[PDB]
């Protein structure tokens, strides 16, 4: 039905969103229920709490992923360390495209929060990053960015060839080229009037890149003086940078 085979397989590797939301929702209700006051029941750390969970879900996704699983643990870690924050932001952006509304932000827990509530209860620094992400959301919404293009961008983000010291480089470049091809074939077969949405889509990766670094720098800063609880997947990957 105009969906190449390679894409049908990537989609099969996607987690069922509803159960990921339920699992994350519970975790946060626990983390927030268990300590029932005294310590730090913040709002910055909470977005940090669900970002951490989202990250674990992303790592599991990559691991169970059709082509990633053929790489040795050494190659896997180097690909995930290089793009983990980009994957997180891309995940957020797509969730806004498929579920976002008027003046709300759809959270991974499956909840809608007023964009005003987020802004007000967070410092301007975080505010700017959140706003830089919505611009991309606005651009993807116009292009009719859909799920099949979303899993393709994910694999293009994960399988990046300019990562140094990859053992099975032949496989990483192969998949990358193969996904690029399946994506172009899909975009013009399903959105032909869209002169170059394919180009538009790829032009988004460098932007995701830039936003990604600014996000890590802010995350590191907030971390250096004790403003996040801790959360080892977030910190671990952030320290894979230094």
CA 148 to chain centre: 15
For residues 115 and 225, what is the distance between their CA atoms, to the nearest angstrom? Answer: 27
DSSP 110-178: S-EEEHHHHHHTS-HHHHHHHHHHHHHHHHHHHTT--HHHHHHHHHHHHS-S--SS-TTHHHHHHHHHH
Residue 104, SS3 per DSSP: strand
Residue 58, SS3 per DSSP: helix
Q: Is 222 annotated for ligand binding?
A: yes
* Under 8 Å between Cβ of 99 and 106: yes
Q: Integer distance in angstroms from the first to the last C-alpha of the chain?
A: 46
Which structure tokens are listed for 112? 């809608």
CA 111 to chain centre: 17
Q: Is 241 annotated for ligand binding?
A: no
Phi, then psi, of 230 in degrees rounded to 5: 175, -80
For residues 99 and 97, what is the distance between their CA atoms, to the nearest angstrom? Answer: 6
> What resolution, expressed in A, was reported for this entry?
2.4
Dmax over CA atoms of the chain, in Å, equals 57
* Under 8 Å between Cβ of 87 and 151: no
**Which element (helix H / strand E) includes 224?**
helix 205-224
- In the PDB record, what is the listed experimental method? X-ray
**How many other CB atoms sit within 10 Å of the CB of residue 161?**
12
Residue 105, SS3 per DSSP: strand
DSSP 242: -
Go through the domains of the chain in sequence order and give each one's CATH number.
1-242 (1.10.565.10)
**How many other CB atoms sit within 10 Å of the CB of residue 91?**
18
Which structure tokens are listed for 239? 């320290």
């Amino acid at each position: 039905a105009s969906i190449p085979h390679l894409i049908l397989e990537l989609l099969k590797c996607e987690p069922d969103e509803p159960q990921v939301q339920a699992k994350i929702m519970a975790y946060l209700q626990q983390e927030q229920s268990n300590r029932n006051r005294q310590e730090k029941l913040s709002a910055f750390g909470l977005l940090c709490k669900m970002a951490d969970q989202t990250l674990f879900s992303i790592v599991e996704w990559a691991r169970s992923s059709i082509f990633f699983r053929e790489l040795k643990v050494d190659d896997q870690m180097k690909l995930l360390q290089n793009c983990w924050s980009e994957l997180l932001i891309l995940d957020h952006i797509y969730r806004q495209v498929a579920h976002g509304k008027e003046g709300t932000i759809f959270l991974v827990t499956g909840e809608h929060v007023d964009y005003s509530t987020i802004i007000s209860h967070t410092e301007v620094a975080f505010n700017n990053l959140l706003s830089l992400a919505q611009e991309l959301v606005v651009r993807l919404r116009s292009l009719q960015f859909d799920q099949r293009e979303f899993v393709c961008l994910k694999f293009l983000v994960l399988f990046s060839s300019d990562v140094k010291n990859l053992e099975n480089l032949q496989l990483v470049e192969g998949v990358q080229e193969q996904v690029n091809a399946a994506l172009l074939d899909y975009t013009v077969c399903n959105y032909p009037q869209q002169t170059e949405k394919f180009g538009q889509l790829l032009l988004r990766l460098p932007e995701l890149r830039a936003i990604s670094k600014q996000a890590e720098d802010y995350l590191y800063y907030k971390h250096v003086n004790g403003d996040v609880p801790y959360n080892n997947l977030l910190i671990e990957m952030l320290h894979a940078k230094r």
